[PDB]
């Protein structure tokens, strides 16, 4: 679930370093269209497009088991469905890390005059 996603994102970055994705660009949080605006945004796309691969269980209501050891989100769980999800948060959380420098507030809380493009499919 997204609680854990808020949690894993913070591990490489700082605590609460997630309010900036509640609504960022075309995909980070409220959104879902018009092709990315930058690296950051794509992680929010690749992450979206990741849950869709989840065969079986749902990603938003599913709590998985995980531990952050010496700077490595290790997904230690014996259920492929659940494990998967964790991995969508691990890969992404690591993504936004390195891409917090291409960051620009002018991609915050946006609408349909920036993401009306030819909506890239997963």
């Amino acid at each position: 679930n997204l609680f854990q996603f808020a949690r894993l994102i913070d591990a490489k970055q700082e605590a609460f370093s997630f309010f900036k994705y509640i609504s960022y660009g075309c995909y980070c949080g409220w959104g879902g269209q018009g092709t990315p605006k930058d690296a950051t945004d794509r992680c929010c796309f690749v992450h979206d497009c990741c849950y869709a691969r989840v065969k079986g269980c749902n990603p938003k209501l599913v709590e998985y088991s995980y531990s952050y050891r010496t700077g490595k989100i290790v997904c230690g769980g014996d259920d492929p469905c659940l494990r998967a999800v964790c991995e969508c948060d691990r890969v992404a959380a690591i993504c936004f890390r390195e891409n917090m420098n291409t960051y620009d507030k002018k991609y915050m809380l946006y609408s349909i005059f920036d993401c009306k493009e030819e909506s890239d499919q997963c």
Binding site: G29, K60, L61, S119, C122
Partner: protein, 122 residues
């Protein structure tokens, strides 16, 4: 998608559901763990199942057609799945409307210590 879903709540409850609901109860925003804290919550909860069950398309990606005509929100996609993502969001924005008074300004921007509980099945 949320872009589409936000504009729907924001068209039944004043002009910006994006906030009050970006993180409310246990199932409104960046969460989804535990048991619904109230109306708005049983809603935010019931929304994600509704989303969950759509297995044909991608609820988070689907761009459906709708219109707010007469004070009633109508869905215009025939694609039996696209007609659903809308119906879910649609009902959702009616759910969040008729219960705006139960809204407890004390449940937004939630932790999870208050939801570390069971993520009720659906």
């Amino acid at each position: 998608n949320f872009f589409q879903f936000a504009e729907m709540i924001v068209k039944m409850t004043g002009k910006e559901a994006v906030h009050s609901y970006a993180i409310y109860g246990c199932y409104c925003g960046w969460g989804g763990q535990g048991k619904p804290q109230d109306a708005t919550d049983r809603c935010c909860f019931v929304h994600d199942c509704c989303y969950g069950t759509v297995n044909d398309c991608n609820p988070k990606m689907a761009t459906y057609s709708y219109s707010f005509e007469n004070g009633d929100i109508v869905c215009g996609d025939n694609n039996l799945c696209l007609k659903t993502v809308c119906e879910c969001d649609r009902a959702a924005a009616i759910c969040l409307g008729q219960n705006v008074n139960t809204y407890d300004k004390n449940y937004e921007n939630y932790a999870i210590s208050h939801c570390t509980e069971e993520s009720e099945q659906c």
